[PDB]
Amino acid sequence: SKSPSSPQAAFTQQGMEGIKVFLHERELWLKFHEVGTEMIITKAGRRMFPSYKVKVTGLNPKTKYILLMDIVPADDHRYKFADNKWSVTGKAEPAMPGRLYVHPDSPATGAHWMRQLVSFQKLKLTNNHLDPFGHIILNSMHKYQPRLHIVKADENNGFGSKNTAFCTHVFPETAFIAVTSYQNHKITQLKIENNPF
Amino acid sequence: FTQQGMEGIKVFLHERELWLKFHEVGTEMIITKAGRRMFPSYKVKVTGLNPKTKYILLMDIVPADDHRYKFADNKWSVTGKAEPAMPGRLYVHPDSPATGAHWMRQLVSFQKLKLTNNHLDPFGHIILNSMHKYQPRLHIVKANTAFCTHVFPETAFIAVTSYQNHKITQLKIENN
Numbered sequence: 001s002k003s004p005s006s007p008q009a010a011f012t013q014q015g016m017e018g019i020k021v022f023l024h025e026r027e028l029w030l031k032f033h034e035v036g037t038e039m040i041i042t043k044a045g046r047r048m049f050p051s052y053k054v055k056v057t058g059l060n061p062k063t064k065y066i067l068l069m070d071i072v073p074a075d076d077h078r079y080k081f082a083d084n085k086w087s088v089t090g091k092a093e094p095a096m097p098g099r100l101y102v103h104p105d106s107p108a109t110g111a112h113w114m115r116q117l118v119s120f121q122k123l124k125l126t127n128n129h130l131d132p133f134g135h136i137i138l139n140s141m142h143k144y145q146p147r148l149h150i151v152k153a154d155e156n157n158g159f160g161s162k163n164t165a166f167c168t169h170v171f172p173e174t175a176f177i178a179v180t181s182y183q184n185h186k187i188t189q190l191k192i193e194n195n196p197f
Numbered sequence: 198f199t200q201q202g203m204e205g206i207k208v209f210l211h212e213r214e215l216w217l218k219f220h221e222v223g224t225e226m227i228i229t230k231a232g233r234r235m236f237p238s239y240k241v242k243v244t245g246l247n248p249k250t251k252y253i254l255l256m257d258i259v260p261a262d263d264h265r266y267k268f269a270d271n272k273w274s275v276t277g278k279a280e281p282a283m284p285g286r287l288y289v290h291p292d293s294p295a296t297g298a299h300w301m302r303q304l305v306s307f308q309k310l311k312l313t314n315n316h317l318d319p320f321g322h323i324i325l326n327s328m329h330k331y332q333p334r335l336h337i338v339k340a341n342t343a344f345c346t347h348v349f350p351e352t353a354f355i356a357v358t359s360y361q362n363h364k365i366t367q368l369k370i371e372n373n
């Protein structure tokens with residue numbers, strides 16, 4: 001497994017700088033990344049595989065935090081897959097402001113979040129731009145970067161103030177191309193032989 | 198989630214192939230009481246800055262996990278749990294505070310940074326514990342404060358009091 005040519009990046013407001021995030025099963029992610037990761041989108045919605053899970057440290061144990069995820073474009077291109085290669089075949093079709101996925105345990109104390117793995121498996125991806133279930137909407141054959149966001153409560157431990165602050169974190173190895181069906185046989189194979197079932 | 202004049206910023210790791218080779222073996226960095234420079238040295242090209250407003254460039258070195266490591270039978274392994282994972286000290290780049298175009302004109306070198314194993318060091322060197330894995334981090338602050346941070350995972354390393362791997366100590370030129 002190569003490492004991604006892009007550094008991990010993070011944007012952090014004061015009060016968040018002690019926090020650290022660790023990608024669960026990073027090597028597994030590196031293998032898909034190496035090949036070029038694809039995620040299937042349907043009208044009903046598909047969960048991601050591999051699923052995005054993180055261990056968090058450095059949270060204030062009884063400050064309240066909101067954990068959420070969004071999936072933003074990584075570039076402005078359409079792609080096609082021919083001759084076992086991804087090529088740029090034109091300009092990305094600008095779309096929705098990205099929806100959020102909020103972790104269902106939010107709001108919660110740092111103690112709660114640090115106690116185990118924050119998992120986002122339940123997050124679903126659709127191609128339907130009229131989705132009525134608040135699923136994340138994506139464009140087939142476009143590249144996307146998942147982002148972690150952590151929101152901290154204020155002194156009264158309650159959001160709605162301007163004394164809230166956030167971490168934003170990006171693992172490059174979790175980037176992927178959305179697809180209505182798999183293109184690279186290696187992706188299709190990695191998923192069958194890593195299928196946790 | 199509006200990052201300020203900062204979504205455009207990109208960072209590029211210098212002499213990266215060397216970091217990759219060394220990362221593939223398992224990067225080791227010797228720490229001493231007087232303090233050792235990092236090898237490989239840490240240098241980056243910075244792009245996408247507001248051409249000239251004042252920025253401050255920092256580096257910290259933080260735990261990449263919580264394990265203690267042993268090196269046995271030509272291999273690293275987990276062996277226990279580390280001591281403290283922060284609060285730590287920083288290296289503030291000497292050119293700081295300075296301007297975007299300035300920062301962008303020549304490679305930003307962190308070569309003067311040193312690593313010591315003396316918990317009572319008076320020279321501002323970064324204090325590490327041997328046989329613990331660490332992760333160099335780059336922090337950028339535009340002069341209510343906010344950090345853009347860049348982490349190159351291939352610069353992670355285990356801190357040692359002397360080189361361990363025979364692939365380093367018995368360096369084979371036409372091999373690895």
Ligand SMILES: [Mg+2]
Binds near residue numbers: 229231232
């Ligand atoms: Mg010495």
Ligand SMILES: [Mg+2]
Binds near residue numbers: 233234
């Ligand atoms: Mg030296």
Ligand SMILES: [Mg+2]
Binds near residue numbers: 227358359360
């Ligand atoms: Mg020595």
